[PDB]
Amino acid sequence: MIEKLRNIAIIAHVDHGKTTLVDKLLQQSGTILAKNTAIKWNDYRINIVDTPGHADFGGEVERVMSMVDSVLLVVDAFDGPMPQTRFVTKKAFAYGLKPIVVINKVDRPGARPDWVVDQVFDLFVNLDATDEQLDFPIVYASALNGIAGLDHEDMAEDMTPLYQAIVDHVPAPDVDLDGPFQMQISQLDYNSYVGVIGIGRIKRGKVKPNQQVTIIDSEGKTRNAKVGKVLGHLGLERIETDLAEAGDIVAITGLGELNISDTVCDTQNVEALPALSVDEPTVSMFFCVNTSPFCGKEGKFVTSRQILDRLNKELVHNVALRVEETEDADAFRVSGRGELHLSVLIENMRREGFELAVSRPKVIFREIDGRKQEPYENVTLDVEEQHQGSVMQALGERKGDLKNMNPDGKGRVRLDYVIPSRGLIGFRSEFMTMTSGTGLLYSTFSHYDDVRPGEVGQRQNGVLISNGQGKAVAFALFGLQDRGKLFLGHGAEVYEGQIIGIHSRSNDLTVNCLTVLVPPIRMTLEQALEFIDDDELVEVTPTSIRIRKRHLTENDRRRAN
């Protein structure tokens, strides 16, 4: 007995009314979303733990997933599944969890449930076991009428089908009621009256107010403490209990400054629960102090220390990230999840008043069983049919393996690829122009595997490199556009070694733009990071983005050969 417990996490796009759904489940029971919603339906206790927004790689998602035994994916009957819920879903599958899928707003005009079922099932090649895609239940919902059913055209008179699906398909928590107390802190909270609050799912035993405990951290260091209050969850609120047991998701109040991954134990049996979120980076990138003639002329913060400090500050609220020191004490090896991750770190360092230069992002190879290996991704593209042949060939050049293609029937088409990150880096910029801006691209890390032999097509064109420092005059630029496209027009301030344009041919050319014009190519940070080669950097300031050679003088470059 006492396993009428169901702990489930809920996933939804922010516009797909997960708040409205839970609210309906709440008011038809015997009981921004609360972080936990405790529902009493029949003799069952259903904990619905919320998931963070689509942008939150602090490890919060896998903290939630470590407390629940299933997941509830809510999907609009017209929009279908949204790309933003991709990563939360991939992590639920990573924790072995099976999904319950709810297709709500099934009564809205233009609803197409059969269609979104296929989408949800197809989105489900986030490499999910047949256990997770075969036999996931589908429950259609209309929050307006508060009705659910296994068939949208044959719905029940209330939400009973959704309750039953949860009871039937969510397993009871894998816990022991009889052992000594053991609970890992998965979430933290705070209140001015009660202090630091530790939230988790009790793995073993039971806890009472004033119970003597021992907290062991991730390392093995311990301290004794006394439980203040034991807050069980009821509805959207918390309330003091005299007793919480194994399987319960509760909050404990008097243990001091708890940390995530701390394990609260009975003093007689101190045993730490294993930590979780090993989310390793797959793409590295050099963050360097700006050593250019414009150093510290647009950015306030430029020394090596404010760099190393700010980087070692994103570490607390980002764990996919790594930061290393290099032999060069003016450069740092920053590694993140994808190329997009490191971009936003820079893009809002720019807004902090930071001035720095960065290298082209490369993949992190990893040796496994004597075999060198690289990361692969699952890529899904949506292009107009007039771009299909062009997009395909490009991905083939970038070591892409076509796994599926599926036409809209209305002009567009979806393509599915397995591709190494090595070949997908910088593709986004090319793709968007190549597709004339219509195309959509979404990537998801798949697995490491043996490296595909060969290289990705290098930049075909060389660059135009400024030979001196000063303001660019139009009399020179008109002569330079005879040899390629420029990055700047009249009177732009320029120094030596700065890349000022794209050569119409393959070799680099050192020219003079200091000695009536086509609009200059202006590049976003994303475009600039795609452009540069291995002997180049992207100079980044709060208000500017310049591209420069690693070696500024033409003599230094030629010497490197």
Swiss-Prot record:
Region span, Domain III: 279-361
Catalytic activity as recorded in UniProt: GTP + H2O = GDP + phosphate + H(+)
E.C. code: 3.6.5.-
Entry binding sites for GTP: 15-20, 104-107, 142-144
Domain called tr-type G: residue spans: 3-174
Gene Ontology molecular function terms on file: GTP binding; GTPase activity; guanosine tetraphosphate binding; protein folding chaperone; ribosome binding; rRNA binding; tRNA binding
PTM entry text: Very poorly to not phosphorylated on tyrosine. Phosphorylation in vitro is strongly activated by proteins present in pathogenic strain E2348/69 / EPEC / MAR001 but not non-pathogenic strain K12 / DH5 alpha. Phosphorylation in vitro increases GTPase activity.
Gene Ontology terms: cellular component: cytosol; ribonucleoprotein complex
Top-rank taxon: Bacteria
Compartments, record wording: Cytoplasm
CDD domains, per the entry: BipA_III, BipA_TypA_C, BipA_TypA_II, TypA_BipA
Region annotated C-terminal domain (CTD), binds A-site tRNA, chain positions: 459-561
Span list, region Domain I (or G domain), required for chaperone activity: 1-178
One of the GO biological process terms: ribosomal large subunit assembly
Cell division as UniProt keyword: no
Record text on subunit structure and interactions: Monomer. Binds between the 30S and 50S ribosomal subunits, in a similar position as ribosome-bound EF-G; it contacts proteins bL12 (L7/12), uL11, uS2, 16S and 23S rRNA and the A-site tRNA. Binding to the ribosome alters its conformation.
Similarity field: Belongs to the TRAFAC class translation factor GTPase superfamily. Classic translation factor GTPase family. BipA subfamily.
HAMAP family listed in its UniProt record: BipA (MF_00849)
NCBIfam families given in the database record: PRK10218.1, small_GTP, TypA_BipA
Function as written in the Swiss-Prot or TrEMBL entry: A 50S ribosomal subunit assembly protein with GTPase and nucleotide-independent chaperone activity, required for 50S subunit assembly at low temperatures, may also play a role in translation. Genetic and deletion evidence suggests this is involved in ribosome assembly at low temperatures; it may also affect translation. Involved in incorporation of ribosomal protein uL6 into precursor 44S ribosomal particles at low temperatures. Also has chaperone activity which does not require nucleotides.
Entry protein name: Large ribosomal subunit assembly factor BipA
Species, as recorded: Escherichia coli (strain K12)
Gene expressing this chain: bipA
